[PDB]
């Protein structure tokens, strides 16, 4: 009775989420460079969000935040390219901080 | 020490430079081989010829091909390939046939260790395309063991000298199929008009089948 991969994939939250556009997710800030926040939200790629002007000091490494997802991976095929160009990061909008 | 080197082409190439004008260099093609299946070729470039020789022969030993030989004297099957615009048609031959091939092919075959083969070169006769095509064709040949393993059948050799005796040359290492190979009443294989014209006694050339020195 060993769970199969097909079963793990069916019941994974990322599978159950469906399309990512306009989905609220919880992220975690793992790296900060000046006012650029690198936030992981459980996907393949992190998103990069600018530090909000209000309560900017509350956003630190490890801070959990609320995001509105737009794309799990930013990619596009441009004129003459044989494959899609990827920036290796997700597109998301930082809404604020998650609190209990 | 076991490898011998042979020159295939020595060419004076020229480039134009702003200051010195027409500048002279040497392009050399050499082939190396030990006579036991291991052989390779390399281009050499230099201003002096002896430096081109050194570069070509020393580089070629790092780019060796291994060439499979049937009974260590000929190729496993007829090889017909085109490399760019150079066509090379090679035929498996029995012992004593010798190397009846383009002089450059003779040189390369002695380095590989092939004693009996016929080859015909058609189209562009370029030494580098001929050498590169030759090694491609010879490297990509299927041995009898590979054929037996691929089809899970015995490879049986029939010789007119040995009459109807069936000589198994290769047997599959894995299980042996029980279903005979389908016998297509008429094969849809492409034929070369030169081979057909010759087998019908229609190829009349004063230059074919001429007496030549042992090669």
């Amino acid at each position: 009775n060993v769970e199969s991969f097909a079963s793990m994939l069916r019941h994974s939250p990322l599978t159950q989420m469906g399309p990512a556009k306009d989905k609220l997710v919880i992220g975690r800030i793992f790296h900060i460079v000046e006012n650029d926040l690198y936030i992981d939200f459980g996907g393949k790629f992190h998103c990069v969000c600018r530090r909000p002007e209000v309560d900017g000091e509350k956003y630190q490494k490890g801070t959990r935040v609320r995001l509105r997802l737009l794309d799990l991976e930013l990619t596009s095929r441009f004129l003459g390219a044989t494959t899609d160009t990827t920036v290796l990061e997700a597109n998301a909008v930082l809404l604020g901080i998650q609190e209990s | 020490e076991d490898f011998d080197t042979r020159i295939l082409e020595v060419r004076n190439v020229f480039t134009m430079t702003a200051k010195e004008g027409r500048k002279k260099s040497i392009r050399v093609l050499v082939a190396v081989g030990n006579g036991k299946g291991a052989a390779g070729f390399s281009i050499g470039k230099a201003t002096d010829r002896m430096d081109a020789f050194r570069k070509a022969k020393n580089r070629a030993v790092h780019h060796l091909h291994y060439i499979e030989r049937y009974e260590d004297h000929t190729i496993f099957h007829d090889i017909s390939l085109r490399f760019k615009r150079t066509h090379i048609k090679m035929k498996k031959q029995p012992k004593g046939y010798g190397l009846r091939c383009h002089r450059a092919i003779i040189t390369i075959c002695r380095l590989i260790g092939i004693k009996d083969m016929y080859a015909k070169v058609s189209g562009s006769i370029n030494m580098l395309s001929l050498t590169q095509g030759l090694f491609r064709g010879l490297s990509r040949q299927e041995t009898h063991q590979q054929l037996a393993d691929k089809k899970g059948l015995h490879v049986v050799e029939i010789r007119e000298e040995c009459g109807p005796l069936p000589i198994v040359v290769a047997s599959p290492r894995g299980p042996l199929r029980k279903d005979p190979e389908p016998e297509d009443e008429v094969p849809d294989v492409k034929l070369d008009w030169e081979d057909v014209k010759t087998a019908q006694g229609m190829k009349r050339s004063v230059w074919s089948n001429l007496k030549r020195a042992a090669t």
Partner: protein
Amino acid sequence: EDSTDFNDKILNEPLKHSDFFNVKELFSVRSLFDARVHLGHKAGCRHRFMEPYIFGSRLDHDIIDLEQTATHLQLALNFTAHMAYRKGIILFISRNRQFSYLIENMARDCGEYAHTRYFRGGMLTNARLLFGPTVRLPDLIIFLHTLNNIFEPHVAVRDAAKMNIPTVGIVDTNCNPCLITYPVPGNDDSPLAVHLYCRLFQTAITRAKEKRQQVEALYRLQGQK
């Protein structure tokens, strides 16, 4: 007289067992799934030679079949462990700068080598000139990322083959595995995936080196008496 017994009891004995180092206990399809190893790039980035390893596309995002990853990873870890047991030089290569520090530390901790920096032309094919005529090259190159920073295959993949060095490589859905000796389909981007790979190879290498000392020590004690 004594060499044939040495090579037979030490070098040839591990090669008679399917899992001599028990590397299957190091991972599971669940452990790989939790590390997000199944997550691949978007379908528009798919490399043709990766289709056989792709479970499917979930809303234009390719999913890597972890059933295959588990079998490929088993072979790669097993090969890596055997090469460490034989005291081979293992070189980790990756240009993903997010993990350069992590990978360089993993190599130092296991007693191996890392090259995460810009790869200069001829490090492998011209090593004797760059390092010296007696320089020993790596016996195994492990790619944690097979692509360079312009999304092309790392030059060492081609040059490792030229020098007849076997390569282990994590190959994402946009990578070319044709020349990688032991490819492992898996996510190369997520920190959880990359960290897992470093733990597995580090653990495989560390166990194999400890096993080599155990066997040698026993072979010597028994030899005297």
